[PDB]
Write a protein that binds this ligand. Structure first.
Ligand SMILES: Nc1ncnc2c1ncn2[C@@H]1O[C@H](COP(=O)(O)OP(=O)(O)O)[C@@H](O)[C@H]1O
Ligand SMILES: Nc1ncnc2c1ncn2[C@@H]1O[C@H](COP(=O)(O)OP(=O)(O)O)[C@@H](O)[C@H]1O
Lengths: 274, 281
């Protein structure tokens, strides 16, 4: 066990940031209900959820980017009283030692949630995948592996033997997009009407959760970015966020909003998903 | 493009693990530290937002130092600066810049700044920066960091954080002239943390029970206060035998978990350093 690798994992891979609550996650009502029931409760009380009825050792969250997979991973950790380790699969590419160290550290910090983003690149190098399967199969340890992917088609039958529950985390529905605007705007000075909120919701069809969050952030900076020179005005004097700030924000975010393959995800979800 | 001579993997490591992709942080998410918040809005955030107006020497500083004991909100502040300035946020511990291999630490520092340049405006947050700016590889990575910090189409802000501001070398100190003391939460800030965190839960605390929680958490950090609420939130399910709201007993039990990790800090050292070298409030 190299102390420099241990340091790297403790400093950069282990999460030390704010906790995440269920209410921070908009939509995905089914995923949240299922995770609470089959993952978090058994993680909190393995003395009652014995079995068989214990938590899975591995799950898969899948869907397009920015739908809340990492958020859900962090929430699993927070709500189960666990430590959270987050790493992208490519950062493992020494790789074998990194994987081993990652599980060793997690074992010392139990219960632990290990979140691996783009896990498809790990499960398809051969040597890294082998050591990872060694580690997950071995995992008595209170470790949950949460894999995330935008490419579930690259998660094969052998990988599905390890990631035994798989949940589709889709783009937010209208109700979820509304949820996000209201939640983020409640933290700001904002003067939107209910009609204007509905318009924002209608105009953000196909936006991800991350796009909705960047929309709101851009909208929040609109007032300051709209002041013309004449510096008298101090922060407390600036006007509230208004519909125009959102219309302007749409012009920033919409060009980064990707247009399509929900088919692939829905197909896979019907086949292998909860 | 400006990245064609860096190794693809070093780029992707910085892009994946060092660059933050997490939720935004708002000023209201940070309890207490009124002086630091007001100051930072004025001399950092507004200039970063309106560099058409805040030109030349009215621009933001190239670097600032946050100091105090662990868990007081330094990283939270760094991320809030980025959020509120419309900037990308990169966070790294100083030890993660170092390597056993000759020339590799310097390479990582150079890569970090090159990726930040591509993603500008950018905030680069460096934890335990005293280690980086200490007092041959240590000498060399320090020198390289200062080259990057010294080297203006650039819209990069370095935010260093330390529990040991006395150990930053004098020369390096001149690069971070703005130094803000981020202390342990005072009683009103502890209360605010409890209220904010319990507003997201099912909770039945009386006003008196809250005041009792605040009295009993003297000397707790913001992180301690957060761990306290987290442990209290899990009390109801942990009290079931083979769900009720959070109550005062869950906090009393939570105190027995958190308190063993809370120990007295050298607050005189921070206060004295803030008086002599810092912004003074
Ligand atoms: N369902 C959601 N509800 C609220 N916010 C979300 C949701 N999904 C994404 N976000 C916002 O976007 C950010 C990025 O989401 P993340 O969980 O990293 O997405 P993924 O891992 O699915 O790509 C989050 O930290 C959050 O601010
Ligand atoms: N001033 C504060 N207000 C609210 N929460 C805080 C504060 N300080 C710390 N916390 C909580 O503790 C966590 C860790 O704090 P962090 O900002 O990493 O501290 P530091 O960098 O000072 O060690 C934060 O993500 C937050 O949940």
């Amino acid at each position: 066990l190299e102390p420099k690798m241990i340091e790297l994992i403790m400093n950069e891979i282990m999460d030390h940031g704010p906790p995440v609550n269920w209410e921070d996650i908009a939509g995905v009502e089914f995923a949240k209900a299922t995770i609470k029931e089959i993952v978090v409760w058994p993680m909190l009380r393995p003395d009652i959820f014995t079995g068989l009825r214990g938590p899975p050792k591995g799950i898969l969250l899948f869907g397009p980017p920015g739908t809340g997979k990492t958020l859900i991973g962090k929430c699993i950790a927070s709500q189960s009283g666990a430590t959270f380790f987050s790493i992208s699969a490519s950062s493992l590419t020494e790789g074998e030692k990194m994987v081993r160290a990652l599980f060793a550290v997690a074992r010392c910090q139990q219960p632990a949630v290990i979140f691996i983003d783009e896990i498809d690149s790990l499960l398809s190098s051969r040597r890294i995948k082998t050591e990872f399967l060694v580690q997950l199969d071995g995992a008595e340890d209170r470790i949950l592996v949460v894999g995330a992917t935008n490419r579930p088609q690259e998660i094969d039958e052998a990988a599905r033997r390890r990631l035994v529950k798989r949940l589709y985390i889709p783009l937010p529905e209208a109700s979820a997009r509304k949820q996000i605007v209201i939640n983020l705007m409640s933290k700001e000075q904002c003067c939107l009407s209910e009609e204007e909120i509905e318009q924002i919701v209608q105009q953000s069809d196909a936006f991800s959760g991350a796009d909705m969050t960047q929309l709101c952030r851009e909208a929040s900076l609109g007032p300051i970015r709209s002041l013309q020179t004449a510096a008298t005005i101090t922060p407390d004097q600036v006007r509230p966020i208004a519909y125009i700030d959102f219309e302007n924000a749409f012009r920033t975010v919409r060009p980064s909003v990707s247009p399509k393959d929900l088919e692939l995800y829905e197909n896979w979800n019907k086949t292998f998903g909860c």
